[model samples]
Every structure is written in structure tokens, then in C-alpha cells.
Target: SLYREIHQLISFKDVLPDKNLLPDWSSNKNPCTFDGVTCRDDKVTSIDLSSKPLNVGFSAVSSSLLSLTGLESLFLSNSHINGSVSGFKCSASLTSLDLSRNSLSGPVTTLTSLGSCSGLKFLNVSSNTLDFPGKVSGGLKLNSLEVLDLSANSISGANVVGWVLSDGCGELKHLAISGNKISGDVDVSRCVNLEFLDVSSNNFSTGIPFLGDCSALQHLDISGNKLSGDFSRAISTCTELKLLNISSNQFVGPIPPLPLKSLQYLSLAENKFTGEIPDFLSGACDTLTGLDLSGNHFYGAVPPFFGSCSLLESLALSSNNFSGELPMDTLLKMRGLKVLDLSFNEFSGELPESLTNLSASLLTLDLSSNNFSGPILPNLCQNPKNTLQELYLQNNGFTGKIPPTLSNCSELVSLHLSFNYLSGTIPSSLGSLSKLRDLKLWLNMLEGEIPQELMYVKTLETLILDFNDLTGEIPSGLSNCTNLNWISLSNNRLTGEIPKWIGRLENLAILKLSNNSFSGNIPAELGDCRSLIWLDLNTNLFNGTIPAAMFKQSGKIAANFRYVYIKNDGMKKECHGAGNLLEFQGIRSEQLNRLSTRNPCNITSRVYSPTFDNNGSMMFLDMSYNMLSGYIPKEIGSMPYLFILNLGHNDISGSIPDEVGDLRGLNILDLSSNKLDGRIPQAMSALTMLTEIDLSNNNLSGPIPEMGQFETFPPAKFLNNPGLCGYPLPRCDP
Candidate 1:
């Protein structure tokens, strides 16, 4: 009877389409005849229906499937299972279960079902909304399990230690609870047979873990945590380890001389670790293939001993205090290197001429944010079979024209040379990189028109060329690269009309053409961009009325918007006045914000703020400083998701529309310096989230609404307006 119930759940109750897809499932047949159902001695032994996209309720799944008295292994991963796994039960014969990547929520506590399954060895419940029980003590345990993967879930709290120490989890060898909120001490020393452990991307902040079985471990990853103290003790006995990642932690001081004999991959990035690169790797130098020490306070030059690690494939020492030039001989010795990142350091002097040596096998080379100077080697990639894929040399003192020989690197996917002093025209030869995805060359002295040849790179996604002296119209051929997701050409001297073909980029999410001499009406074709969330055309010579068609996404916007360079933008204390730099809340991206401050003109911070949720689609729209003349588009109010709507400093006129109240999400409304007249719409009172409102310097009339966010505005926000009175401003009479 239990077996019959299980067959019904998989074929009918699971909600899988093509209900009859399980051809062998028939009431007249034996249980073994059912597809995915295995039988031993007329008893169901296992059910492997993985990746079947089964959509079923938790109650039906638990009652029908888990009720099987003889069932063993069960594979139902990557399914559409939803609701709480509260009434789950497992057969004593069950040894394996997989319920990963589903809508399963709020039921980690139901894991108690597996505790009684003495034969259970493997359990995976990853990539769900499941979390630990609220109570810390007297929780369920699974000592019989060997492999447990609870990654990418909300499973958390200090009780996780108790779960590990439980008798059922004693024999566990592979344990992964990454991407959780688990905090507190991790002492898994009793699991002497454990090998692979990943507790990364969690809130495990108490201190380094105590792994008594480290000698048997092959892979250990505790990265992305708040753990501190010297890490040497954690891996003190892991002599046979092959991989270790302790990145993004609060670890400080010099990196310990770890046991590296068998280690092939290691990452210590994003820590406060200081001190010089150690040279004690001679014992395991040949075995170490990957090393990352980036985002630390490590000072001094990279030790020459690193060159002796001839088998190394990837090395990253970026964002450190390392200085001085690297000798060509030292770097050329590692011909097997595939990726090298030395960015965000204080390294100076010309790049080693032997950089070409790594081009033969190198796939990525990032040396940005350094003091490296001197012209790029004309033959940077002279190797006949150059495998170079990504080249990043931005934010450096490197000068001279970009090397035309860079075209030789046909496999290049990303080329970043922004924030450099490079002069002369951008090499037209760069168009040959058919695989190029990101082409960033902003803040350079490069002149001349953007090469039309670039349009040939159809794989291009981001084309950032702002803050350049480039002239001439934007290449019409750019329409061919329809894969563009972000197109930033702000703070340039480029002329000509905004191309109409720009509307064809359906995937474009960000468009910035501010602080430019491009004289023409804003292209209405831009309304075709269904994915456009951020558009900034401020501080430009754009003329004509705001396109009504642009309101197509008025009600479709996703959540809040974050626009950089509003007038004086970003979080408090970080924002400086002059022009709106950013609006919305969050820590400003230091790199992007810093680069914008160095642009041709004060373009504030280039639009690059992260948006959290997408409640509505039209999040940010700024047309300020344009020659726009017309009435405020009442259709604009339909933009329920619009967080910042700036139509200020334009020739816009007419009465404030009552429809404006429809924008309940409007946080920043700047209509100042405009010719708008008539009574301030009472609908304006509906904008309660307005952090800043600029109705000043506009021709207005009538008493301001004494409701909602109006009375909260400062007198400066209402000043210079004709006959405007409110609580913050002069009082209005009855």
C-alpha cells in the first residue's frame, strides 16, 4: 500500500506535465515497473527522478513518498517543491535524499525526520529558504549522515554546532553549510574521518574553527566570514590538503607559513593581513598552482621566490601596499601562469618587457590602480598563439597611444584602460577583438572620433568611453552591437544627434550622455528600451520636450532607483553640494564615484548606484539642464516606481498635475529652475518618501498642501517661487 501511494505522487500528485510521461507507471503493474522506481525483492529500493521539474506540495510529497516503509535513495533535486517540509518522514532503509534548489521554505527543523534513518548517509537540502529552528538547544541531530549540503539557505544560529556534534552526524565526511547565517564556534574535531568542509559565506564570526580531523581533510573553505585571530592553528595538521580559501575575513597580521606540500589552490584575499610576502614555499612550490593574497595590507615587493613556482596557474596580489618594479626575469620564469592580477597596489615603473612571455598561456592580466608608468609595449602580445583574454591596466600613469598590437590578442573578452593618461586616438585595430565584452577607456586623453570598427564586436556588453576629448558623432555602426547592457559616453565633446538606433538595444539597463555637447532632441526611440532603469541626460545641450512615450514603463518599474550625480548625491556625509551627485541610500562605490570626480567637467558621480529591489521598472529619469520646454507629463505620474524624477533647470512650464501623486515611490523630485506655473498640485502631498524636493526658483502659485511631505520641506526648497506658501515657507492665509 505504501508503494502504491508513492507511485501516485510521482505520476499524478507531483503536478508534472505530460502526466502520462511515466509510461511504465500503471496501477495494474508491479511497483518496479514505475519509471524512476527501483525494486529489490518486490520492495521499492530507490527513486531517482532528479531534474524532472516536478511541481508538488510538501504535504503530498512527504505523506506519499516518505511513507514508503522500504524506500532507500530518493533524488528529487531541482524541482518545484513548495510550502513547509513540516510533516516529513523517511524510511529506515533510506540512505540518500536530495531536495536542493526548490521553493522549500521554513522547514530546516523537519530535518529531524532523517535522524532516525540509521542507514541515511547522504542528505542535500541546498538553495532554498530553509532555516534552522528558532530554539538553540535540544535540537534534532543526524549522526549517521556522511555527506550533508545545506548551502545557500537561511540555516543559521549557534546551535549548528550542536547539530554537528550530534551522534547522527559523527561519520560525516563532506559537509557544506555555506551561504547561511550560522554564527558561533565551530568545533568539528570529533569527525576525524571528515575530508571536505565548506562553511564559507556565513556569519561564523566567533573565531577560527577547531578541526581536529584536519589531517584527513583535502578541501577547507571558511571564506566570507568574520572570523579573526591567526589562522595557522586552524590548519596546523592539514598536511595533505589540496585547497584552502580563507578570503574576506577579519584576519590580520602576516599570513601563516601554511602546510603547502599538497595544496594546489589557496585564497587569502580581502583581509587585513599585513607583512611581506613569505618565501617559505620552497617545500611545496611545485605543488602550489593558484594563490590569491589580494585586498590586504601586505607591504613590500613580491618575493622573487614566487617565480620559482613554475607550475603556478593563477596569482593575485592586488589591493596591497606592494611597491617597486618587478624584474622581467622574475616574472618570465613562470611561463605556465595563466592569470595574474596585481591591481590596486603602489607598484611603479614600466611593465616588464617580458610581459609578452606570459601572453602565450595567460588568459587574464589585471594591473590596474597602480603607479605603473611608461608606454605600453607596442608588442604586448607578440606570441603567435597568444591566449590573452582580459587586459586591465586602468587607473595608472601609463601614457602614449594604446598599443595597436593589442588587436593580436583575438581572445580578449574585456579591455579596461580607464583613468590613465594615455593620449592619441583609440586604436581602430581593437575592433578585431570579436570576443570583447567590456570596453572601458574613459578618463583618457584620447582624441578623435570613436572608431566605427568597434561596432563589429557584437559580443560587447559595456561600452564606457566617458571623460574623453573624442570628437565627432557617435558611430552609427554602434547599433550592430546590440548586446550592450550599459552605454556611458558622458563628459565627452562628441557632437551630433543622439542616434535613433539606440532604441534597438532592448537589453540596455543604463544610459548616460550627460555633460556633453551633443545637441539634439532626446531620442524618443529610447522608449523602446524595455530594460532601461537608469537614464541621465543632464548637463547637456539636449533640446525639445520630454518624450511622452518614455512613460511606457511608468507602472512597470522595479522597486527603488539609485541615480548617481543627481545634484549633490549619495548617503549623508559622503554627499557634497554643487550638483546632485547621487540619490538613494547605500555606501557609494568608491571606485566609480572617485573616477567621476576626475571627469572632463563636474559630472558628479557617474550613474552607478546599486538598486536593491525592482518594484517598478522606471526607477530613475533625469532630464535636467536640457533645453526641454513643455508641460510636466502627467503620464509621468504613472511611473509608480520612479524614485528620482528630475525635470529641473529646463524650460518646462505648466501647472503641476494632480496625477503626480500617483508616484508614491518618488523620493527625490527636482522641478526647480523651471517655468512651471499655477497652483502646486495637492497630489504632491502623496509623495511621503520625498527626501529632497526642489520646488524653489519656479513660478508657482496657491497655498502649498499642508499634508504629507510638503510641510516637511525646508524653506530653501520653496523659496524664489511666486506666491507659494507652506509650513516651511511663509504662511498662507485662508
Candidate 2:
């Protein structure tokens, strides 16, 4: 009976209870003969039960796995398929289907058993939790669908390429709707035998559609859609396109000469495409290899046969607008380059010391946010296999020293020479890498000392030597890294004291030793860093107080600095403030300089306070200026995503605390240069999206309360004063 009802729906609490934990699972001669059961000659074709984390649902997983019938391929990836698909009754020797990474919720409709399988050739329902896959008004004919994957679900906005071209995808060679959330227009002409077309992360604006007789194209991904016009001619007709991802979309005029006999892996990254790179991709330059013209708008310099390509291996031109000088023998003749991003370009001079002779076989090297300026590569450690592992020369300008034989890479794991100017020391063969995980040399000018074999590696995770000029002592075997998560030795010249086994690390998330010289106190075992988001001892000299588990992950470490300074902060959030400013957004800052406090006081005398447990992850809360005083802590009104609350200057007196208007998720509120006063707290009118406010000078007499966001901050964010006014300044006298 269909493999005896799949060994009677093999249950046993889905295995693994120290190996045998049952739950009324069926049995037919103990035939739960596992390993993704299959019983031909009898029935059931094949069922590769993918990652069965099934707590069950989705109509009991299509009535217990599409009821089988010589089932060809059926894998429920990362299982536990949720709602949606009110119907799907497969049986026609199911060709291939993998409901990838499921949690499948609603929408993405257009039913009818996905067009009765037509011998369905491979269909992957990629990463799900599908949002609106509802429209395209029932069309898109899947003619023997070659291979179509609804990638990372949530089918982009409207007109799904005109209903997948009136529903009968003309023999779609292989189409993957990458990370969906697909947008408007975008039509790839019923996919004329489309070779491999991935609509990369949708929101498809217009243009690029005109795939002239698709000529067996090869891999074409329209990266992060919102596509715009003109690209000389929508790829003229891919000829036989070879891997081309039109990155980020919005492609505009010029720069369209390619087709030098089937281009190779070209990503027009974050496009707006303007000139350059054209000129017939310099005569096919030998079938290129991974060349992303990062975030477009091409500008001068960069053209020299991009180092004569030569089977290039990963080279993202970085944020575009090019500009000269790195013809470095066409990148030392490719020799199979490995990941080389010329960070945010403008490319200046100096970098060529034959660029470490391409280190025989290099690995990950991004010359950060350009400007270049020489000195420092004195033979990037002479390459002797040490396959240089990630050495991003940060921000750049590199003035001398530190070349003490780069401690010979030794499979180094991240050694970003921070915003350069590197002055030496710390090089004790860099404790022989031991697979070191990030040892960023912060804003350099490095002075040494503190290298007790850096607590013997232990696979450290971010030990940024901030502001540099290092001075020492935190090494009580530096709490043996235990996978330390972000520890900035701030401002440098480090003195000792603070390290009571830094609460055994517990995956600490950012603990900057601010303006170091590190005095005493504060270290209630770092309150066992419940994965602390960020805790800087500003202008160090640590005294005590501040702690209560530093508000337990202060709302997920400030939702990662509210995703970094909440740039377009007013539009109800959701990405697009352009990311990665030192990505790895675990929220930690030291660069951008300007920190200098030997004592201005920002005590941390513990008291069980810190409940930013508004739980969604708090943004930032600089205990500004210093000499931290008292009572503002009503658990800082339970930080429901408090966005940046610098208690400016400091010596914080009390009063203003109406539980800080519970910070209705405040957006940049500075207690004006501190020592605060009374009255301004009519529960601070529940913050209603306050734009930016500074209770200038403090004291604060009032009448002001014109409700929320302080009537939209104006008058110098509350200029000068010891007094304070209303409607953002005027309404105060009497």
C-alpha cells in the first residue's frame, strides 16, 4: 500500500532522542527502513526527506508527502513546510522538486499543481516564507519547464514578467527568481529556451527586456532589480552570454560594447552604468573571469585592459568612477587572481610593488576606500605559500613601517591594516596567526608592546587595535579569545586593570576600552555579556555603576547601530541606506577618530540596571562626555529601540527623567551638553519619531510640551541655555 504508507509515516518523534524517541509512528514489519525510504516494484518512487525538522503542517505535508506514485524527486529542504499552496497533488512520476529552506507561508499563487508537472524537470522552491507571489494574473505556461526556481521567495512586485510570459514559459532553460520580492514591468520574453536567467533580487523597474532571440544564452542575472533604460541595446542578444549579473539595476546610457565572443562572468554591480569597460571588452581579453564593475557610473583611468584579464579570478572594481594608475602589469599578469576588490575607487598611485608578485596564490585583498598613497608593501611578506588570507589595507594613505615582514601571512585570517599610516610594533611573528580571526590594526601609527603572543590565538574574533600607538596590559592571557566577538583596544596607550576574565567572553559583542590607560573598578565579570551589543568605557579610568547586564543586548546591540546611523532615518526603516561600512555590523565603532579621555569620568559602578530588553535590540546609547552621574535610569525607559542617546558632556544630574518618555524609539536625543535639570520631562511626549534634539546646556525651565518629537526639532535643537523653551524655542517666556 504505497510502501505501506511510507513505513506508516515514519515518526518516532522523527528520530534522535539520543537515537530513539518514538511518537506513535506506524509500523509494517518494523519497516521504517529509513534513509529516506524508497520502495519500487511495490510503489513509491523516491523521497529524499530533506532536513526533516518537521513539527508538521501544510496540510500534513501534502497529505503525507504528495501521496507518492513512483515519485521521482521530492526533497523538503530545511523542512517544516508551512501554509500556502492550498493544493498540489502530484503524480506523473514527479520529475524533481525541492521545497528549499521552508517555512512556506502564503501567496505566490497561480495554482493548478504548477501546471501538471509536464514531466517537470527540476523545480526548486527556494528559501521560503513567501509574501506576495499572488499576481501575474494566472498565465505563464511552463512547457516542459526545464528548470525553474522561485528563489528566496516573495515574488517581486506586480506584473511577474507578464505572468511568466503568458504562462507557457517557452522552454525556460533555467530560470531562478533570485531572492524574490520582484517588482514591476521586467519581461524576459517568455524565455525563448532561456539558458540561465536569474532575476536577481527583484523590484524590476524597466528596460533590459528585449532579449533578442535568446540564442541559448548562458547565465544572466539581473541583480537587485529596479531596472532602468538603455544599455546600448539590451545585451544586443547575448550571443551565448556567459554569466552576466546586471547588478543592482537602474542601468542607464553608454558602456555597452561587450559580446567579445561570449563574455565571462561580468557583474555590472549596483548599476547606473556610464562609460568605460566598453571598447569591445578589449577583444574578449581571453574569456574573462569574474569582473564586476562595482556600483557604476564609470570615470577615468581604469581601462588598461584591466590587466589583460587572463582568466581573471574575482575582481570587483568597487564602488565605481574609476580613475588611474593601477595597470600594474595588468595585475602582475593575472596568474589566476583571487578575490581583489579595489575598494570604493578613485585609485591613486603607489600600490604597485608588483603587488606582492601576486603572492604566487593570493586570497582576499581589498584596498579599502581608495586614495592609495604609497609605502608599506615592502614585499608583502615575500610569499612562500602563506597564501595571504585577507589583508585589506583599510582606508589607505599608508605612510611607512609595519612591513616587519608581515609576520609572513601564514594563512592569516583577516589583518586589515586599518586607516593607515602604520608605525610598527606588535609583530612577534603575530603570534603565528594560528588561524587568527581578524586582528585589525586600527587607525594606525602603531606603537607596540602588548603582544603576549596575543593570548595564543584561540581563534580570536576581532581584536581591533584602535587609534593605535599601543601601550599595553590586558593580557591575563587575554581571556583566551574564546571566540571573542569584537574588542577594540580603544585610543591606545593602554594601561592596565579592567579584566576580570572579561566574563569569560561568552561571545562578547563589542567592548571597547575607550581612550585607554584603563584604571580600576568596573568588571562585574562583564555581566557575562549576554552577547553585549556595545559597551565603550569612554575616556577610560573605569570606576563603577553602569551595569545591569548592560541592558542585555541593548535591543540587539542597537539593531546594529540602527543599521548604522539610521541614514534616511525618517522613512520607517527597511534597508537601502547603502550598507557595509566595515560590514560585519555587530555595532562597534572606533574609527572616525576623535576620542580622547583619560578621565572625564563615565563610571560603571554596577547596580543591576540595563534592561534595554525592549528586546528587539537597541541602537546606540553613548554615555557621553563623562564623569557619569545618576538617576536617568528608569531602565532608560526600557529602550524600545532607542536610537542614539548621548547624555552629552556628562556629570549627569537628575530630573529630566519622565522615564525618558520611554524613548518611543527616539532618534538622536542628546541631553544638551549635560548636568541636566527639571521640567522638560512631560514624559518627553513619548518621542513620536523625534528627529534630533539637544536639551541645550541643561537646567531646562519649561512650558514646551507641544507634544511628541518635541514639535519637530528646530531652534538649534534647543540652543545654548540653562533655561529651555517650547515649540522648539519660542513659546517659553511669561
Candidate 3:
């Protein structure tokens, strides 16, 4: 009988039509033995087709898969399914159902059909496009649901919190409605059996949620909202709480002593809490494992009482006003510490020699942006129990050479030591770390040749060594690392031709080789990189023609990089030129003065508009101050997402291609100091997004177009061009 049902389920043209997906199933075999199908006593009891490319509609799933008489659970998550669930239905014996990460939509009431399954205890329909109307009639009827997850959907309405529990929630133990548009009062007073609740990343407003007598609640997260006011009274009775996260909210005032006796984790980051940490937290020292109180107004040194919490594994106190030396003696007491972050504070003084005592369990340690001085300890990884993985000590006053003994960290993944007084050569011993991915040492006084031993790190993704005194050609052995994505070697004394092997890296995205003395033609093989987006080779001694092949990828690139630039009109002088000014680390204001054409802009302001979607294309391209002598290729117009294009101070001579107007997204355009002699193309007037443009110091002659942004530019932008005239300059004789 089960075999007959399996046949019917796969017969539907729109549902499971790909017989290859179930290659093990056949007419001669029992349906119980098929893949993704579980059975007991020769009867099918469960089915899980998650992550399969079953592109079908909701009706097809409800009609076929739910027809199984003995099926108790069904999981179709991440399937390429779509359409509404208005007529959705399921088996009466179904106790668990997961349809998350799909395109299921329609009114929230469509889920009421699942209420018919009186035994249904678990239901997850998250990461979909379902909407919650302002007034949900009759409300949900899944009274037996013990676990419900409706997060990451388009659900909205002020009554969402009430509607979900309107039918009674005495049996509901876990509920997650985060990443939605729900707001207003939240009352979980009736959910006496609720143990876990996540209402984060929503529109919840001021006033505390009425969580009355949460005796059974163990996990509660209400972060990433506009919530304010005291929640102490609401959670005063939560004696059984184990994890509580109220971070990224507007809650103010000093943190009060919580009544939780079994609490293991607590996060109050990104809040307005003031004063020093309370000593009363030592009450749960036996069970507490993690604590985060970063991004607040907390001051003074850490309380000595914290040393009593030996069970603490993770602690974060970044971005605060806490002063004085680090409480190393107190922290050393927590032998179980795994992650310790004390960055972005006013703490000063040298690190203690006993820090390696916790190396046995320390997985990550961040102590950046402080005034800590003195040379890095050589025995940081001397212990045999060392499990250190990530070490961040940038933006400090570190002196002397890097400890070669740090290579003892067998699991080291990221090592950042930038913005320090570190001198001497980079330790070649770092190549021993096979798992290392990021190695940043920018803005230091180090001097030496590029270490060829670094090529041994096959997993390296980011290799940023800019603003150093390093010399030597790009090591050819580095070409073996196919995972290399970001390679910034700017502002160095390196000299040599660009390596052609770099083109083999399919993941290479950002390549910065500016302010160097490299001499050679631009390698056309760089066009082979399918992810090349940002390319800066300005102020080099290269003499060659522009490579038209570089723009071949155009709209075919991938969005694998994450960088943002904000624009502030008040600081225009510091940010004059095209392209998004990335506010990245190790980039000092003094470096901006060294820039030949572009300036890294403000740190805080409105996000630059006209951001592109995932359809990746070159965003920034600067080849200015080079000896390139050729015409701007018309193929350059193929880059519709190009934000900044600079080719000034070069011997390039030819009439501006009319196709340049095709760069509709262009924000900055500079062609100054070129030998071009022709009237500016009329098609150039189509660039309405032009915020900065300069066509001066060229032999171009024409009446500047009286359209688009040409008239808004300053006369100096068009000066030195004897034949150029417009509203911004001398008007031509009509």
C-alpha cells in the first residue's frame, strides 16, 4: 500500500518529476528503502527532501506528499518552490513540518489548515514572503504546537504578537518571530510553559515586554529593536533564565543585578548603560560562561570580583571609556576563557607576561585600538596546549620585531598587527601556519624583501602590506594560492613587472599596486579574473597602451567584496575626486595628502547613492600619472556599473569616444593632462550622475554642452583648454 502512494506522489508532472532525484526508488523495491524516506514496520513514516531542486508550487506538495497516511514528519526546506498556500493542507498524523527558505506566500491565514493536524508540535515556515494582515481573523489554531518559527518573513502588523498566541500558548515552548515588521506591545504573560523566545531585529518600540513570571523561560533574546525603559521588573522573576540578550536597543541607566541564578550568557552590547559593572554578577559565577557589555558608557577598571567567575569562557568590553591597565591578574583566573575582546578602549600599559597561561583554551583574542606599549611577548604560544586561532593587536604602540615563535599557533587563522611602531622584517615563520587566511601588517616601519615562504600558505585570502618599506618583485610562488582575493601592496618600494600568473586566480577582486616604481605594460591576462572589481595602478613608471581586454568581464563579475563609502559635503577638500572613499583601517589622514588624484573621504555621513545590485562590474579604475599612450577604448563603455574612471597625466591622445556616455552610473570622470584634441562628445551630456569631472589641461576644443552636469562644474575644470567655452567658462560666440 505504501508503494502505491509513493508512485502517486512522483507521478505528478509538476512535483518530483525528476526521477533521477530518487534514483534508488523502483517499482520492484519497497518504498521504505528509498532515499530521504524513513519507515517502520514496512510503512513510510517520514520524508526529508531539503536542499533539493524540486521547483514546484505549494499545491503540488500538499496534494502529493501530504497524502501519505502514516507520514509523521516532512522537511522541504531550501527547495525551489513558490506560489501561495491558500489551499494548503496536510495529513492528520503529521507532527512536524518545515517549509522554510522557500518562496511560499499569501495571507497568514492560509496556515490555519495545519491546525487540523491535532498532533502537530513543530512548524517552521520562516524565510518566506508570507504577509500578516492588520487583522487576522480567527487567528492560528495550532493549539498543540510546542515549537513555532515564523522568522525572516515579510510578516507585519501590531497585533502579530497577540494573534500568534490568541488561541492559547500553554503548550508553546519555543517561539521565534524575529526579522519581521512587528511592533507595539508584546504580552507573553499567558505563555507559562514558554522556554525560548526570539523577537529580535523587529520594530518593537519603547516599554518592556510583559513577560509575567517566566519561571520556565531559559532563553530570551529581544535585541535589535527600538526598545527602551527598564525591563528589570519584567524579568525579575525569571529565576531559571540561562541566556538573555537585549543588545542593540535604547535601554539606558546602569545595569541592575539580575535575579537569574542559572544564567550562563548575557549580551548588553550597543546600549546606553552607564557606570562600572556591578559586583553582584558574581552570584552566578559558577554557571556564567559568556558576558558582553561593549559599546556603552561604562568607565573605570573592571571590578576585581569578576575573578570569581572561573567558568567564564567569552568576554567582550570593546568601544568604552574604561581606563587604566588591563586586569590581567583577574582575567587569568578564568581558566576556561576562549574569546577575550578588550578593543577600542583607553586602557594603557604593557601586556602581562602571564597572558599565555590561558592559551590552552583561547581561540580568539582582540586587544586593538589601545595605548598598550612594549614589544610583543615571544612566548605567546609557548604552551603545548595552545589552541590560539585569531590574534588582533593592531592600532597599538607595539615595538620590536614580530615574534617568530607565534608560528607555534597551529590553528592560527587571522593575524593583524597594523598601525604600530613595529620595525624589522616580517617573520617568514608565519608561512608555517597552513590555516592562515588573513595576514595584515600595513602602516609599519618594516623593511625587507617580500618573503617567498609566505607562498606556502595556500589558504591565504587577504595579504595587505601597504605603506611599508618592503622591496622586491611580486613573489611568483604566491600564484599558487588560488584563494587569494584581496592583494593591496601600495605605497611600498617594490619594483618589477606585474606578474601574469595573477590572472589565474579566479577569486582576485581588489588589486592595489599604486605609488610604486613598477615598469611594464598592463597585462591583458588580468581580464581572465572573473571577480576583478577594484583596480588601482596609479603613479607607476609603467609605459604602455591601455588594455581594451580589461573590461571584458563587465557585468559578469561576482560581488565577493564588502566595502562601503559615505559622502560628507563638509569635508569636500579631503575627499576631492571620484569613487567611493573606503573608510578602511590602516588608512591615515596623512596618506590622503600622498594621493595623486583621489582622496579617501569622511568616516561618517550618508551612504553614497546609486549603489549597484549584485550584478557585479568594475566600480573603481585608476591608471592616472602613468606613461600610457593610446585612445580610450570604446569597450570601456561596457562597464555600466563603473563608479570612477581616471586616466589623467598620461600621453593618451585621441578624440573622446562617444561611447563614454554609456557609463550612466559614472560618478567621477577625469581625463585632464592628456594630448586629446577634439570637441567633447555630445553623448557625454547623458551622464547625469557626474558629481566630479575634469576635462582641463587637454587640447580639447568645443563649446561645452549646455546640458546635464557640464554647466555646474567650476571654470577651472575646463581651464587651459583654449577652445573650450560654456556657462562655467567663457561663452563661445554664437
Best-performing candidate as measured by lDDT: 3
Give the TM-score of each candidate: 0.87, 0.32, 0.91
Cα TM-score of candidate 1: 0.87
Can you give the lDDT of residue 323 in candidate 3?
Answer: 85
Using TM-score as the measure, which candidate wins? 3
Worst window of 10 by summed lDDT in candidate 2 = 572-581
lDDT (0 to 1) per candidate:
0.78, 0.66, 0.82
**Model 1 over residues 103-128: C-alpha lDDT tens digits?**
88875777776566677789898998
Candidates in order: C-alpha RMSD to true structure: 4.4, 25.3, 3.5
Q: Write the per-residue lDDT of candidate 2 for residues 490-588, one digit (tens) a residue.
A: 667888777778887877666666556677656656656656555656555554345545554444442232122212232322211111112222112
lDDT of 3: 0.82
Lowest-lDDT window of 10 residues in candidate 1?
580-589
Model 3 Cα lDDT, one tens digit per residue, 1-734: 65666675555333465756767756656777888888888888888989987888887877778767878998999987788775445577889989999999987777877776667899999999989866655767776899999999998878687778889999999999999998877788889999999999999985677899896899999999988877888889998899999999998889986964898999999999999888887798888899999999998898887888888999999988888887888988887788989888878888788887766679998888887899988889989878999998887888998899989988999998977778998888998999999888876778887778888999999888877888989988789889998998877899999888878989998888877788899888888888888888877887788788878788666564633354434235433323333324523333333333323544444242234355678878888778889888898888888878988778989989999999998988889889988999999989989888888899999889888889888898888988888779887877
Clashing pairs in 3: none
Model 3 Cα displacement at 679 (Å)?
2.6
